[PDB]
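Q: What would this complex look like in 3D?
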Amino acid sequence: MLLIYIMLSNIVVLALSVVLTSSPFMALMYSILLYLNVQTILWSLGYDFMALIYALVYVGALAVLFLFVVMMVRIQVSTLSTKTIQSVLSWLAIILIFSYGDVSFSFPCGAESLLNFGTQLYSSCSDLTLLNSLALTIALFGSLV
Amino acid sequence: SSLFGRTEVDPTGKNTNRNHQYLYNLKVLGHKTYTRRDPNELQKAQAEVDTLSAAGRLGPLSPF
Amino acid sequence: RLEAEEVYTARSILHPILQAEWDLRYLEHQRKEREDEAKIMKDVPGWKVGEATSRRRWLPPVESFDVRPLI
Amino acid sequence: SGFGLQSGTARCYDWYMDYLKCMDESKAPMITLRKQECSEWLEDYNECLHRDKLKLRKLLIEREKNKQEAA
Amino acid sequence: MWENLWYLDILINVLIITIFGLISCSSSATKSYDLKGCFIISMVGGVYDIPSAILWCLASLSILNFNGFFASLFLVFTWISNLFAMQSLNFLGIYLAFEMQSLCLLVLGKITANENQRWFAYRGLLKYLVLSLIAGSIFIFHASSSYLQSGVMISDSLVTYVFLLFKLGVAPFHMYTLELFSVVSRHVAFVFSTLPKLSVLYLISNSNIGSECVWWGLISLWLGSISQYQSVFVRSILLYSSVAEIGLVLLVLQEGFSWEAFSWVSIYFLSLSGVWHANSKFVSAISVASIAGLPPFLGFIGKAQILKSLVSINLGILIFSSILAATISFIGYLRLIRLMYLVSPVKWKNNKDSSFINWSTWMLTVGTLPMVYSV
Amino acid sequence: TWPKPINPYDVPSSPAYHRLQEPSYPVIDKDPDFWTAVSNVRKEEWGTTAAVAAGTFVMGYYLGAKGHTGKASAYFTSFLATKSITLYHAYNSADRLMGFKENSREVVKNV
Amino acid sequence: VARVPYSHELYAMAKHIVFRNEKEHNAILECKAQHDWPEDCKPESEAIVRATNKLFQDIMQKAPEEFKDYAKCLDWYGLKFSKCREKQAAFEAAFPLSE
Amino acid sequence: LYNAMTPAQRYFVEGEHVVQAEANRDILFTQLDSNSYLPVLHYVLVGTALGVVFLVLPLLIVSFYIVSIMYLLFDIEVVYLIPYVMTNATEYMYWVMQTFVAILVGGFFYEWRMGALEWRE
Amino acid sequence: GTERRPGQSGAWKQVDKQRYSSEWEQDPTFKQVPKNVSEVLDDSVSVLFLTDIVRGMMYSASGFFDDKVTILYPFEKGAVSPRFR
Amino acid sequence: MNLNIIMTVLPLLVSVAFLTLSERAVMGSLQRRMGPAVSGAFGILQPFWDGFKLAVKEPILPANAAAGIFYAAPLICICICVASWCTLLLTDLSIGGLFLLLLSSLAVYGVLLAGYSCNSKYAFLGCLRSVSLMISYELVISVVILCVILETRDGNGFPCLNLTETASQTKIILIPAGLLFYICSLAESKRVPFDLPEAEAELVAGYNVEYSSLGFAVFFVAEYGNTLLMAALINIYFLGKLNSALIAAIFVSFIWVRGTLPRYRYDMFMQIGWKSLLPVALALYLAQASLGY
Amino acid sequence: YALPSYVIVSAAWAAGFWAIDTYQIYKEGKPSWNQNKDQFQRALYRRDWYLRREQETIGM
Amino acid sequence: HNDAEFLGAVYNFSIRSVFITGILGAVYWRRNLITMLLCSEIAFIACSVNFLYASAYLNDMAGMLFSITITTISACETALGLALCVGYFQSRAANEVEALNLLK
Ligand SMILES: CCCCCCCCCCCCCCCCCC(=O)OC[C@H](COP(=O)([O-])OCC(O)COP(=O)([O-])OC[C@@H](COC(=O)CCCCCCCCCCCCCCCCC)OC(=O)CCCCCCCCCCCCCCCCC)OC(=O)CCCCCCCCCCCCCCCCC
Ligand SMILES: CCCCCCCCCCCCCCCCCC(=O)O[C@@H](COC(=O)CCCCCCCCCCCCCCC)COP(=O)(O)OCC[N+](C)(C)C
Ligand SMILES: CCCCCCCCCCCCCCCCCC(=O)O[C@@H](COC(=O)CCCCCCCCCCCCCCC)COP(=O)(O)OCC[N+](C)(C)C
Ligand SMILES: CCCCCCCCCCCCCCCCCC(=O)O[C@@H](COC(=O)CCCCCCCCCCCCCCC)COP(=O)(O)OCC[N+](C)(C)C
Ligand SMILES: CCCCCCCCCCCCCCCCCCCC(=O)O[C@H](COC(=O)CCCCCCCCCCCCCC)COP(=O)(O)OCCN
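A: Here is my prediction, written as structure tokens for the whole assembly.
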């Protein structure tokens, strides 16, 4: 329970660190740590395959593309530090306003089965998977040109 | 399907408008409906179980 | 798969028994809880112990012993 | 979907199907009226989803227990 | 399995045409007319109703004026996405279809830009991308809250209504059209300002996505008219006209007048075809007259449908605003006529590729009297 | 409650799309195969298939000749349109066998 | 408190239960199919639990060592029947199934 | 260590012995904690600590972008193929998988034909 | 051996020449099209099964077991002739 | 914690040290040379010298780089190796092999941060070349694993990739995929046939050369540890129950195949992975999802 | 000579394998601690644990 | 009194904070395009996690499917957007100084 709470609470700090830092490379590192913490949150809800998917697709592949771009477009963004006290508390107040008093539901634990998930992906929800494949094909054809 | 569906007319006219979600859930998932056992039936069966237990014919509730 | 059919047959045999003994334990625990609830709500007017939260269907406990967080 | 994440159906699929069946039975000319006629089944479905009434009952029992203990 | 075959045939068709084009890629046929005809034939297997037949008609008329196998393939992808937007039954279908269409828009915008046009076209595509990400993220977050609260995914909700307001391009959600379509190819702007709307209108009509609020259509009407009157550049005039008209059509569609909006979208496609594919001044003049709603052409019928639906619902503020904003927009259309024949000598490119432009002008002039029954 | 046992090899599965309709007409075949549906395609439908094949051959040749590949475009277009229309006819015949569509000729021809 | 033998014991006696205790098993399946509330199914649940415990006991007297060996071997091999064939044959020989 | 909080999770077993046993238990896969990733996280911390000890001891005394995109997309495609191999498939699940792979192979053929698979660029 | 395949080359322009022209079949050193089914299988298995690689592997593996040639410099010294300067 | 973590970690360190010794002993064998013999008499004690001496060398202060990332890369490699081995030996995870695939996709980070530390325009391209190799052959490994789960079924009949269950039976069906797994494992450890680095790295293109004393030790140790993990995976998937001799024999086979093979150019091995290995692995994945259940 | 370092590697990992196997079989109580468990098998282990704790409470 | 209720409230707070940090973070703290897309990815991950949470809550598979759909669509969008960013940076004129930082 303490471990679950620590992860749920750490997600917000790892999200704040991304926007606050002025270096695009450092924000990517913070985002990778955020993605791992999201894997860890999904473990508490009972998902292993889905939490694996988040790490494989995002940490494994997407971050590599982001960092490839970041080195290619390398720019001097160490111009100045504008992180005055007045700005940071304003950001925190905005965040508190948005994330307060929303409807909360008891924390669930749900065991998943990739047998059932596979059967549904390829029998009943087969319309979904083929359209996702079409979207991937669109992205491939568009990005390569 | 679960996500997508198209709509066609019936030349015969026998089939009519019904909720497509309800029909789809009946066909793919199915509806489980349960009754409630009448008290007099339950009392007789429970008394029979207790009577056999008192005679010693039935086994223990816990093995150890 | 012959092994798998053997195991499935065995599991389908044991499941009714396991379910029945879970229901019995649940029933005894629930009567204990209702006794304590009636003891607490003796003072309060207009309180009925054992009120049906669902009119028709039984509401199963959301929490179960079987599902435990991986972490 | 309602497929159930392990096997079978979702934990509250049958309550929603009860509500849908009751909406199918009605003869009201608009969906809104039909929902007005079948509201009680929807209250069962919301009860199974979130168990708010049972939570309130537990809260009242806890509050009275604390009041008794303090006295 | 037979019901699945109807959808599967469209896939198999598209895949084999794709691989045939990839194999038969040569300089001898850069304009692949044969694959265009094959794509048009393949899209006939997706026609099941009148709205789907309208989707097919507009898709084919669009694919005629795209050049190359690759752009025609992405127009076919847009057609598939639109066909599934019409058939979507819950949140997931709506989302999958519409962001697939957004991906097709990004690709089509990228591939129709020259090297000298990259600086502005890629900026507009990027700005469109970020705004679309805002819209989709808000949609899916509220969808998660709704799916948690209700236990079911129902496409009759405020969340999908606001998301479809973003897709339509009304009141506070029309800026992505102004930024993107100003910097992209004229055909890309034409096909993606008309064809996407039909699927959204069908989804709204069939899935009961209507709100009691009339502020957004009113704001769309007034803002579009006034900004059209104040805009110096011609592309902005045409772009703001669509905002005003789609706000008015949104007000009509909420009240259940599906037939009239389905006729309006087709008449608007035909009317906009000539001004966007400007090759002749006279064709553009007839197109601009049709967009204004002017009586001798079919555009009068399409606007008349919407206005006739307005008087039925009997909302006075909407009618008063409609009259005044229509006058304000008419001033901008008159600016367009003035620029062509009454300002300076005009010389344009001799782009003799009027595939359906002459047919569209003929249809605008002719079609008024056959369709007079509608109004 | 207790987990229900699952048999890994026999897990209930179903096709993605469903036609929600009770058969109005008699059911010759509850689950027709592809060849059963093709064998029940009417003669007029086959003539329509042949006409579409010829027309698409002519059109494919006309369009491909503008790109200096007339023969290949003609054959590809013919195959494409013929396959699509044949699947459409087979779907109609399968629906007729299932009793969803009118089947008086079918029931007479194959008892 | 309602209780049935531990897992490995239940597996070792699984085949015998349907051969010997058919009546209660069918009754409980039918009643659970009909009624959702656990109170409605209480007599049949009691019957099947008591019958299963009785079967455990009468195996304990007729074949004490053979049942113990089969249960221990099942627990050792992670509840897998295939690796336990020899002990299964010896136990079934000692305690004949279906009487 | 996840601890059950309700009687139903504790198998309606009464007393405080069970809560004490659960709280001070060891992570044993045969026992309550099966398919648990908590040992993996403990392994992660142990490795990090060992690395830190080594680190601190001495102190005292276009084509790449293209391959990244293709890797991302083919990786997602294999992500969808993973659930299929995890099921005892039927004929129709099989043919859906065949259509999926057909689309992936069409993309791969496009890659091969356009010369992207060649890394000259 | 000395014979070369149309596909295998180290220069991009030469690869382009051989990919799009058939002047390599005029040249004697290159290997000609198999012209029989069995020859196609032979060449295909040769390329796909990494045959030439294994042949070098055995001859290199002869190195493991052959008599090592080495001198323990402190204990043994290399032969030095009288003329050595 | 558990005492098993010790019983996994310590053998790993000892094994990696003697792996480094084995490499040069086998090189002496190919080249009619002998194992190092002045370090001691037995030679058991040779790699320990390199580690302990490397502790001695005076530290160099970091230059024109962010300190955090430069420290981060060694810690990443040392974390990944420990997690991989302790999830190969001490876990019951139903999809554990897929977790190992995930942990192998995180090895791209160590090289990539080490390259970013350089901040040389040439080093950008070199580190991109190395990571391009690793990801390109990770794809084919993923397809091969899809092949492996296809014959991997447990006694209960449930498909899984539990390492003990795939270890339980030896399937000669899978051997065609094991050859591709062996080639890709050579690629992922940057062995000579795919050792694009050594040629580029002699001039400072950019690699763990920047790291000097203890950071450099852990990288090289992690390289051998990953090679040994690949050997263990080849054993456990395709060759039955885990056997120490088989693991070390696969490692020696790596050294032998390296010795008998020259290196490939960047476009060459990249074209091999995409146009040769991937179609064959998709053809075998078809052959396995389509040899049936 | 290749074999001595080879055998050091082999023997070291053999010893580690034996140590982990014996340790877990001593703690877990069965060689099948690592084997794959589905939902039914997991819930069965959990009920066994809870029922054993209940038996300990009842006995004392 | 209930740990699950407390954990549910904490999760709601955390996930909402992550969403708002993703959507408005890069624009409030004026950043380059590359950070904007990374924060958009963060927000999409927040929504997908909410859907998985709902699936666990209701024992339903719809959210699992919608989450894999989010992963695919977000990855495709990010790939195309990064393509546009690289093409945009390659066409920059010498006088242009912070081309990527339009938000300045
Ligand atoms: C020849 C006989 C035609 C007469 C009747 C047509 C029906 C039979 C179809 C026969 C085909 C003829 C096509 C004509 C119409 C097309 C409709 C249609 O096809 O489906 C409808 C038909 C049944 O739908 P339905 O009759 O509409 O009724 C359903 C409900 O009522 C729900 O549908 P609903 O929407 O109609 O509901 C009633 C509606 C009432 O709606 C109406 O009153 C309709 C009014 C008529 C509008 C007509 C214009 C529509 C434009 C589409 C053009 C057609 C393109 C053809 C595409 C298909 C080509 C075959 O009430 C409403 O309120 C809804 C709003 C409707 C929209 C508002 C109308 C405005 C339209 C825009 C006008 C604007 C002006 C534009 C300029 C005009 C100036 C002159 O479906 C079929 O019969 C099967 C379709 C199969 C098509 C192709 C399959 C065969 C080939 C398969 C293999 C293909 C590959 C091989 C290729 C081989 C060749 C190489
Ligand atoms: C634009 C739409 C996007 C989304 C599309 C979703 C809709 C498509 C979903 C289906 C995807 C393809 C799945 C196959 C469709 C047709 C089903 C089928 O042909 O398989 C048969 C499987 O049976 C067969 O008919 C075997 C012959 C199959 C021959 C091939 C037909 C399907 C080919 C699929 C195309 C993939 C090929 C590669 C793609 C180019 C159905 O299974 P059963 O009949 O229930 O099992 C057989 C048992 N018994 C006959 C006794 C009842
Ligand atoms: C009741 C009708 C009223 C409702 C209206 C809607 C229904 C529409 C019914 C009539 C539609 C007529 C559409 C006319 C389109 C005009 C024809 C056309 O565009 O031809 C192009 C075609 O251009 C192409 O790209 C050729 C590729 C496609 C070729 C046609 C494909 C045919 C596919 C088969 C369609 C059959 C229907 C399938 C079954 C229904 C040639 O022009 P260009 O060479 O590009 O430039 C012209 C230059 N200039 C005039 C200035 C000299
Ligand atoms: C009158 C009935 C019999 C007609 C004879 C044709 C039957 C042949 C089988 C069908 C083939 C296609 C039909 C021709 C239609 C279009 C073909 C075409 O595009 O014509 C010319 C060029 O395009 C045109 O000139 C436009 C012609 C438009 C159509 C004019 C003919 C109208 C009647 C033909 C179709 C009638 C129906 C066909 C049978 C149903 C093709 O150029 P090339 O590719 O170079 O082939 C010529 C071969 N060679 C130069 C080597 C001698
Ligand atoms: C023909 C039978 C008909 C039935 C059809 C079946 C098709 C084959 C299926 C069998 C599956 C096993 C295949 C083994 C993997 C080979 C993959 C393709 C082979 C290949 O293309 O050759 C080269 C790839 O191997 C390489 O050269 C990579 C570099 C290897 C260096 C490391 C070698 C390690 C030792 C070999 C593995 C041994 C494992 C045990 C020690 C490419 O090069 P290319 O240019 O010639 O081909 C391109 C010419 N267009």
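A: To summarize the key features: The two ends of chain K are 65 Å apart (CA to CA). Chain K has two helices and no strands.
Q: Very helpful, thank you.
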